[PDB]
Nucleic acid binder design. Structure first.
Ligand code: CMP
Ligand code: CMP
Ligand code: CMP
Ligand code: CMP
Lengths: 203, 200
DNA sequence: TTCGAAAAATGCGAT
DNA sequence: CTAGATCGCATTTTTCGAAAT
DNA sequence: TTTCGAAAAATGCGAT
DNA sequence: CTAGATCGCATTTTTCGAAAT
């Protein structure tokens, strides 16, 4: 932390959420902004039957609930769920705008994050439009294997995730994921036992 | 609109005829665009050349903003003119200088990125949750309620090819063709050539 | 580090 | 022709809270 | 400112 | 099973720019 973060937080209300809890409900009126002090969350949307699609994972340093800031009468566009325990700062849009008046760098930071999220989401549209499930899963496994929470392994990198969650990322049933992971292992591209998956030749 | 006039006085104005390329995907991003007149399409292509439309943008919209917040970024997509366009262009360097004297310019830009993220997230949901028939129906209906839609005694009228609908929903032109025939069979639309009447 | 539920995840497979 | 979604249960595998170290 | 005949672009095939 | 992608071309629309009154 530094004097700027402390200055910012002194204008916020800090709350702690346990793993699996819901921070933002899709459809509710948006009047506040959040800043992740510690922890990680998953951004998701769902269909009429409850099927879920994960749009993104966010971490400490990331703002959340920002899309309603620029125009009143807006509703939350997605659900945000705590992936681990989280410490989150909350502030009304009304007061956040006053803070921008005294220190506009805060808007620059928020804007940069939205820009990155738009590039990532546009790429997802492409993957879904141009790639079959095998290609989407293959790319998703390589991407996770290169994140900072991924563990090293003599044959490449190791990650821990369920077939169901992979299905929520790539847009397919958990059964299809399971059948493809076995084919990938037969082709000796990976090794998977339980939630532990080893991605080979990532190095 | 003092700021708007102030902003434009620092830009270079260019014109692009319909179908021309304003932004090439993969090239280095160093300049920001602002549409003064006309409309464009933002699209991505696969290795085989198939295309997918991410969005249509119109007068008042910024373009090429994604490479501004990080160094060494490349254009994330192609931008092609749909109609003849009049566009204001300014370097990232100079734009940053304008942000300093009046950060409200960044506010208007951020507001558009916020809306584009909401829209693109909705598109992800549609691609993952709806079959082609459902995606085509929603698209026909949204197009029919846009300002450029024509009045018709049976509802609203639009003009578009089966190939373009295919680039919007992510399916082959042949599939769009078969689905439009089935939707006509259900009396939801009437299609002759590029002209489609959405009953209402 | 440990151990026994509790609860979560997984395999099924011809249409 | 090629890809995938389904569905009800019985089995695995993982998580969790408190003892044991 | 209407009309018209190419080029160009778009569409149907439809069992596999 | 249900949903969609494919391919080689002849045929059906659209788009255009030049010619007229
Ligand atoms: N097209 C899709 N088909 C099936 N499940 C999907 C799809 N898109 C997203 N999902 C979600 O991904 C999840 C993967 O595990 P489940 O089969 O339990 O439930 C699935 C849905 O919630
Ligand atoms: N595509 C996305 N990528 C990343 N974060 C998103 C995306 N869509 C929505 N969000 C976040 O989820 C939040 C849900 O509530 P808001 O709409 O207020 O603000 C949204 C963003 O912070
Ligand atoms: N899954 C897809 N299958 C086919 N075409 C697609 C797909 N996704 C995007 N497209 C594009 O949309 C276009 C629709 O018409 P075409 O079949 O001529 O060419 C198609 C591609 O350029
Ligand atoms: N999902 C999207 N919705 C709207 N506009 C987009 C989207 N993705 C990219 N763009 C625009 O297309 C531009 C391509 O170049 P840039 O990446 O510089 O900036 C991008 C945005 O201005």
């Amino acid at each position: 932390t530094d004097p700027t973060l402390e200055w910012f937080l002194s204008h916020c209300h800090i709350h702690k959420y346990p793993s699996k809890s819901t921070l933002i409900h899709q459809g509710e009126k948006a009047e506040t902004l959040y800043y992740i002090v510690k922890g990680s969350v998953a951004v998701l949307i769902k269909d009429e039957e409850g099927k879920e699609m994960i749009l993104s994972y966010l971490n400490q340093g990331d703002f959340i609930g920002e899309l309603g800031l620029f125009e009143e009468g807006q509703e939350r566009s997605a659900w945000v769920r705590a992936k681990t325990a989280c410490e989150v700062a909350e502030i009304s849009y009304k007061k956040f705008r006053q803070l921008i008046q005294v220190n506009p760098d805060i808007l620059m930071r928020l804007s940069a994050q939205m820009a990155r999220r738009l590039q990532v989401t546009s790429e997802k549209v492409g993957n879904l439009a141009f790639l079959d499930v095998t290609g989407r899963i293959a790319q998703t496994l390589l991407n996770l294997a290169k994140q900072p929470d991924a563990m090293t392994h003599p044959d490449g990198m190791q990650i821990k995730i369920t077939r169901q969650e992979i299905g929520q990322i790539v847009g397919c049933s958990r059964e299809t994921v399971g059948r493809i992971l076995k084919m990938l292992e037969d082709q000796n591209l990976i090794s998977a036992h339980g939630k532990t998956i080893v991605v080979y030749g990532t190095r």
